[PDB]
């Protein structure tokens, strides 16, 4: 409802899935998709490909909403957290930047115990 051709993309990558949400600065979440909704399972669902096609299916779900530029905010410790630039290039979008929004590593259950030092 602001018609600015401009918005934000929020990514969250886990050790199974990846979430992609596209939102307007007025708080209207224009569309969302996951690697799970794309029919994938297990380690393949966690891939940068499975995240990229979830973003390409989401760019295909905002294709009547009038938007052309996005700024990216990346979150989660999993693989496939920054392949969305290749989905923007597939859909013809312009990009501002890719910003990491990692929160403080609270809890800290089962990090890799191999070695140390």
């Amino acid at each position: 409802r602001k018609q600015v051709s401009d918005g934000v993309a929020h990514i969250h990558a886990s050790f199974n899935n990846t979430i992609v949400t596209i939102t307007d600065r007025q708080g209207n979440a224009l569309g969302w998709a996951t690697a799970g909704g794309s029919g994938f399972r297990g380690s393949r669902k966690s891939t940068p490909f499975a995240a990229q096609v979830a973003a390409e299916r989401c760019a295909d779900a905002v294709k009547e909403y009038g938007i052309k530029n996005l700024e990216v905010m990346v979150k989660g410790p999993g693989p496939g957290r920054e392949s969305t630039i290749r989905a923007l290039n597939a859909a013809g979008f312009r990009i501002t930047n890719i910003t990491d929004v990692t929160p403080i590593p609270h809890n800290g259950c089962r990090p890799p115990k191999k070695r140390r030092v």
């Binding site: 380690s43 393949r44 966690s46 891939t47 490909f49 693989p79």
Partner: protein
């Protein structure tokens, strides 16, 4: 060194201005007889009036548009960690990777009529599916392999 390639790079056709034609007169034409090979050279545009393809003046441009590869898979073995990574093919080599196809059921066909035979494959390969793309759909299969890393 020895390079094992002619690396051509030719001149375009002297009455069509196109480089595509100056490479495609070489298909199903043998021992370089291109000035007496009247039974095949250019004649696929004259026999398309008996085969299912459309707009003969672009029928090779559209057929080539629908068969070319986009990637090649190249291992990077370090331990491994075998890295079966796809990378995109370069803007000339994308055509050379398609040079051997489209004739594999025409050589090798009987019933003479070479020009009508080439117009049959010029209609069948342009479907982006099944024939002429069996190795293109095998690159698509080899592009599934890097997903094993997760």
């Amino acid at each position: 060194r020895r390079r094992v390639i002619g690396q051509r790079k030719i001149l375009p056709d002297p009455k069509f201005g196109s480089e595509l034609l100056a490479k495609f007169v070489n298909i199903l034409m043998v021992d370089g007889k291109k000035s007496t090979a009247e039974s095949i050279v250019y004649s696929a545009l004259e026999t398309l009036a008996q085969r299912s393809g459309k707009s003969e003046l672009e029928a090779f441009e559209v057929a080539l548009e629908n068969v070319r590869p986009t990637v090649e898979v190249k291992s990077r073995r370090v331990g491994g960690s075998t890295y079966q990574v796809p990378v995109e093919v370069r803007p000339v080599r994308r055509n050379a990777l398609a040079m051997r196809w489209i004739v594999e059921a025409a050589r090798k066909r009987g019933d003479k009529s070479m020009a009508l035979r080439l117009a049959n494959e010029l209609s069948d390969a342009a479907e982006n599916k099944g024939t002429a793309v069996k190795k293109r759909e095998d690159v698509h299969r080899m592009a599934e392999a890097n997903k094993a890393f997760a």
